[PDB]
Symmetry: D2
Subunit: 499 residues, 4 copies
């Protein structure tokens, strides 16, 4: 690999525009907030996207007896706490309107352990009035300027019978239109969008856009979900195990959908992938592994070519769709495990966070960039999906260099380093680990670091990087400005045992 | 090495009774308080011992004109702050009375960059009144029960001309007596001692105790310093380099001094080694190295056999005896470097801090203990003082183990791992590193961790441990209570690329 | 009032043995843990008592299909997190076993907005096994010594139909026996008790204790709830308004239940009042008022003469029994309001917290104590239950004192000071106030401080104290050790405008 | 007083552009950083200005033996920590080059307890190289863009014999030229100024600018100091008492100086008052008083009309020009006393910090502003320099109000409230107070808060404000948007003892 000294294109920040979260009511938890702080220190997402804003634990919508009439009462006690805590961590709501508040619901169908109601409202004017009240309260508390930077998606996965009664397309379009007109009636520059579908039903997007064009309904972006797992071939009381398609299958989804939009009546609409991961199940052990990290590295590297954002589902294991987690590593979606133990996928994100803007080189296994200070940062990955026992990959890089000498820092996560899941197993898989076992897992969960000085002969540094199975590695290369001549008389040979 | 299953002897906590510090005026620094918090978190010393309580930066003794007379004014502003901050970190003062305030000094001779005055008081009754005022202030602010746990040392190294005018033996005995009687006069339980002498003239200890015997002077303990370095053979504007004697020569020092006490009129006096380190210079690079940590490990394993406490000089590179530090790694005495970067010797101490009470085995290269919960903890070291390179040892441990499933955690510091000084050289030795260079040094300064599960064939576990040159390693061996049978149907072979 | 100079009687610490809380699942909230940290810093309770350990949000009990059979699974994820957080704040669980896990319930009846199921177990042996699993877990994680210090209550208000199917007395006695015997089977030193009833059916206490004697069921203490409000006479969509009885009526309940126990077959059983407040409704505005503070002071004053502990319901407005709070001050039981604004009652507890052990004087309006350092601390209160108006009381304290000069610090909470509820109404009663309005309510919630120096004649000081309507006041009287003579030449008359 | 409803003119933020500090070596103290954090939370200065950057405790300039010769060595260890800590608290240095490093000094004369050397350099080329090295290291560590916003002042009070050998004007101009030219040679955009003189010799400012015009020396700003105390009429071993000129005398200094600049060859140069206070002594008790707050308030109100910044000397009592402070309140210059106890003057600044941009009305006793949200903020003060008793002013504000219901919040500091000095005296003036005595003084140091709701009468609200002797008060008036009609059924009459 010959690395050009100059780039020309920029590597975009789309890969960290948004991250997913479990339902909004869980943001009230201290553990959730510990994990969000860690994520915002080490990664720094701009937006956060989750379900349940209008569900009943957050508690917004209630019907109250004042005399002999039921009247709506809007309780903002919890979401004011929640959004306050988001803004204090420099992250903003990617608002999702749903699910259906009980008192508004037209039927009983629910989804998840927490039972979000998945039926249309029994009265669409009550629904619009809910939407207007919530958007006006955001603007009252946080100001119009702030709330214009937010994003507003309507519903979640309406194409699926588990998420929306009868996967009724035309009723979803009615809910979309009522919600998007209500939002635009409070302020015309609020950004609203949909339809938030998952894969294998892309005509919904084309029908959605034809609907909004004909009926002149505002849409400011398209959203869609992307996963690559197949239906489980094995279930346990605890787990689903699923086969995964390769990362190219996911990147082909992004590209397919973008092509749908280009042929539509809104050819230039932003595309936001509002959930993605390998597996769509929150109890698939693959999410805890180094495989998951190496898999997601190619998405981070190329995803931004096709989409305006892609939101990893999720930043943390604080999640209740299938009940409270039953062991420390339980197959959860999170970048961060309970107790703030980063998983291998967490490090993939912090690695991409060290990259510069200027893109020098990219292929299917690496990306090489240049920073403002002139130094070079590269992330390399070795995704290996087969059962094999010794599938290393040598990469030789040839980096041009005017300096005399260079300092190289390399960080690695793989099946051996930065991998707390493997140590948790050597521990006997404790479900509810002691505080001491947890301190050990935190120590072990950190990337392996290696350093060297290298002299740069004939303008060039030669780097041969061996990548073990499912390794992701960051390599940073900086100019040594050597101060050693300043230490007049210095001689390590004068220290007992040295040089 | 076949490790017994039962102990008989305890391993004493003497090795962390006390640690040394730069002069007390430096405890006002935020950086000093940062390193102290780090050390108290990971090691947990009981006492802290430094110079300069009565020197002029701390400000206690002034003369002021009142009613046409020079009268003493005792300013407690700074040592109230200093001692309040020690008690907040659970550490107590091992109080050293010195050096001589300027307004009390009889002559002009000083020591150190900060100019402690090293001459007797112009008036011994003024000195006694100072001592009484200081001790009584301590009782008023902290209460008698707290202050009775502190210890009181008189002066420092009065056998060296640098530290006491003319190294005047009889003048020192006189200062001692006035000081000791002053302290006892405030409260009979306050423990006072001396003569705080360095190596090379232990006739001072026998004479000091003869003087106390004959003049009926209180003495509650004997204090002595120990170093193993020869006078410097090479000096730079920045460094002293010195040859070192092997660690046995320091343990002979402890033993010899203990013999001299047992031969004296006070045969049961506690012995405190109130400073020790390899080199007595605060500008000798050996202190920054893994050599220093392997050398110190031998001392921590056996020093407690001969003495009641031995105080490592010092917990921190916050130090000014030879002027402000001129580079990050400058030969300082500290366990912790500036920016709270732990040196190799810091880890030697945190490793001994994981050892249990019950001593199962000790030789010149390892110590093996058992904890209350039944786990085994061992520290091993490979000290190599020659310039060689081919001095990697191999150790075979046979450890009895009632369990049958074992989790082994190992931590390593050596020339490669946990070693910031080496990476600092790879960086070009920055004198004044950037924030990012400092964050990198903090990561690389962490011990390397390795873990495994092992089955215990025959109720014993055979470990073979390779120790590289000047490695110190902690090995912890704990019972697995395996929970994997409760994961009914678990099969990592069903995860893509896995078992 | 002449205050005796020496005491004889001790003022017990019983008043802060225990506090109440909202259901345990709420302890996962960051807001809860902020309020708890504030209460533990300023008051420092030993135990905390709440409902829902076994209810389904905490998630302990699940039935899971293990290939062929429905088997129990015990998920400790959440209560380990919760009990870890209590022990880090130095507070211990007063464990209440309840309510009924949905998967164990024999019928459908529930209580509260969070739906605790209130029916007996379908299988008493499954219940027993739940209990043994939970207690054994606590021991494994925290150790027997720690767990022996906790207390274990069985269910809650089983004499009320809303709390227990049919208020069925014999069914409750059976659940008790099964739970008590299960706890004793794990460890015999664990303390278990009941019946946790409210007022108005004290034959339950005599029947419970007769049941336990006849069947030799272990009982280690008796618990009882006490309130003085009548049933609501006015309801709003948001409030219950209730008339109160005077505080003597509550003290008469304490005394009465103690009398029942002394005539029982267990005449020496500890009595724990496991809940008390003025009103039993979490939506009665009286709880936010200065009236409530003056009413409770009387109880803190004397309650401990009759009972071993009395647990204020509750430490915080973080509470959901009647749904999420609909305004800042909404009649909540808490000492601390949302945003960690202390209500008037909080300050009544902080004031009793400045009292010494030595009891000098007490009557129905004041308590006077002497501290170990010799200083005097008194709390005085002017409870006025009538609609009256400028109802101002005068007290004259003749306080014996050897000193000669005294420093007096007085802190006042009343309808004017330390009263955020009154300022909140001045603000227009914002339901969901902005951050700036909150910082204001926090300022205004602080007690008013007044101070003076008084010269005290005849070993005696004369204190005349005006108390406004529903005022609570702390007065502290300290010896002045005057340092003014040391400021030779001081003259405030030499400062412009001063003396 | 009739306040107009509209403004046109803006009240500028000049009053908080810069604040003074004790010598830069003190910034290493934890206590200094505590006080700076408090000041930055509640006031928020942009720059900070102190002495001793080039003095020997900060340690930059050293001469070192390298082989035969004495070479310069620049030690940046300490100022890097210091400047890092400033920028972490969002405050930037107003760099002052001085005093003279010992090893560059041409003579022995020193100033202050800490002995800053006050003589010209022995070689002006070494000085230049010092200045070039310091400025280049700043740009290396912090970047040119950050450093371009800093200001660089040369020396301090060179017109005073105590500050500059012989008060030699031409040696000063020569030092200025060398320093100004060295700063520009590193980067021409850097802002350099002088001559940093105290009052009573403004001919120095005209000779200074005549010198710069004729010799073509860069000057980017003029600097000068302002004080109004006369020579001490009474001295104590610990105090100077001084008569104070009225506040107009200081505003007339500012206005006089700005007129000198306008008539000079550089008519558009910024004027920075780099130190001001009432007394120039750091042991004058007037600084701890409410008089000092009321005095300074007139300056904050108008000073900005004449000068670009005016820097209160100083933010904190962490100071050592006249030795360590001998008591809690010792007449020090600071806004914040030791233990982070705000003095009354601290509150004058936080009160001005509540003011809005738009100026409505200002006279010699008050200033009234409007904020962006429409609310009104006023600071009023009652400066009384004579010794009388009841010296109360009454002010009647008639406020134009577009509202209809108004919430009014007043904060008060005077001889009774917000005044820890008065209470410290009632305590017997403890020199070195306990932790409890300090906690009491911190409570008492808080401003007194009063609130009310007021109905706006015909378009207007009438306010009558009674100001006691030396009061400073903030009054904020905000629209009540009343939520009470939302509380359908609410009746405080239903709460026992209420409406």
């Amino acid at each position: 690999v010959n690395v050009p000294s100059n780039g020309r294109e920029k590597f975009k920040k789309n890969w960290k525009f948004c991250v997913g979260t479990g339902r909004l009511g869980l943001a009230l938890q201290k553990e959730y907030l510990d994990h969000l702080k860690l994520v915002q220190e080490k990664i720094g997402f701009r937006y956060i996207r989750g379900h349940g804003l209008l569900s009943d634990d957050v508690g917004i919508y209630r019907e109250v007896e004042i005399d002999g009439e039921m009247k709506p009462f809007y309780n903002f006690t919890y979401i004011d706490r929640i959004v306050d805590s988001y803004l204090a961590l420099n992250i903003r709501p990617f608002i999702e309107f749903g699910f259906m508040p009980k008192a508004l619901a037209s039927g009983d169908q629910t989804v998840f352990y927490w039972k979000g109601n998945v039926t249309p409202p029994k009265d669409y004017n009550k629904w619009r009035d809910l939407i207007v009240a919530v958007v006006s309260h955001f603007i009252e508390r946080y100001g119009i300027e702030e709330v214009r930077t937010w994003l507003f998606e309507v519903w979640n996965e309406p194409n699926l019978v588990n998420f929306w009664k009868d996967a009724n397309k035309q009723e979803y379009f009615k809910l979309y239109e009522v919600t998007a007109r209500a939002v635009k009636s409070v302020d015309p520059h609020l950004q609203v969008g949909g339809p938030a579908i998952c894969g294998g039903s892309d005509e919904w997007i084309t029908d959605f856009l034809h609907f909004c064009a004909e009926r002149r309904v505002p849409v400011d972006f398209v959203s869609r979900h992307a996963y690559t797992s197949k239906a489980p071939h094995k279930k346990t009381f605890e787990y689903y195990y699923q086969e995964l398609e390769p990362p190219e299958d996911m990147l082909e989804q992004f590209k397919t959908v973008r092509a749908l939009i280009r042929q539509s009546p809104f050819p230039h609409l932003p595309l936001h992938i509002t959930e993605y991961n390998t597996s769509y199940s929150p109890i698939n052990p693959v999410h805890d592994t180094a495989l998951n990290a190496a898999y997601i590295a190619r998405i981070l590297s190329e995803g931004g070519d096709y989409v305006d954002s892609f939101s990893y589902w999720t930043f943390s294991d604080v999640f209740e769709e299938m009940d409270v987690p039953k062991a420390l590593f339980h197959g959860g979606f999170g970048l961060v495990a309970l107790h703030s133990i980063p998983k291998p996928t967490f490090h993939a994100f912090t690695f991409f966070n060290a990259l510069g803007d200027e893109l020098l080189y990219r292929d299917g296994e690496m990306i090489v960039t240049r920073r403002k200070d002139g130094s070079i940062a590269a992330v390399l990955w070795n995704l290996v999906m087969e059962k094999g026992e010794g599938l290393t990959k040598e990469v030789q890089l040839v980096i041009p260099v005017s300096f005399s000498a260079v300092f190289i820092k390399r960080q690695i996560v793989n099946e051996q380093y930065g991998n707390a899941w493997r140590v948790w197993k050597q521990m006997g898989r404790p479900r509810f680990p002691s505080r001491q076992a947890v301190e050990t897992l935190r120590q072990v969960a950190q990337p392996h670091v290696m350093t060297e000085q290298r002299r740069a002969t004939d303008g060039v540094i030669h780097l041969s990087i061996v990548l073990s199975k499912n390794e992701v590695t960051l390599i940073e290369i900086e100019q040594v400005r050597d101060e050693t001549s300043t230490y007049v008389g210095l001689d390590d040979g004068e220290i007992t045992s040295y040089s």
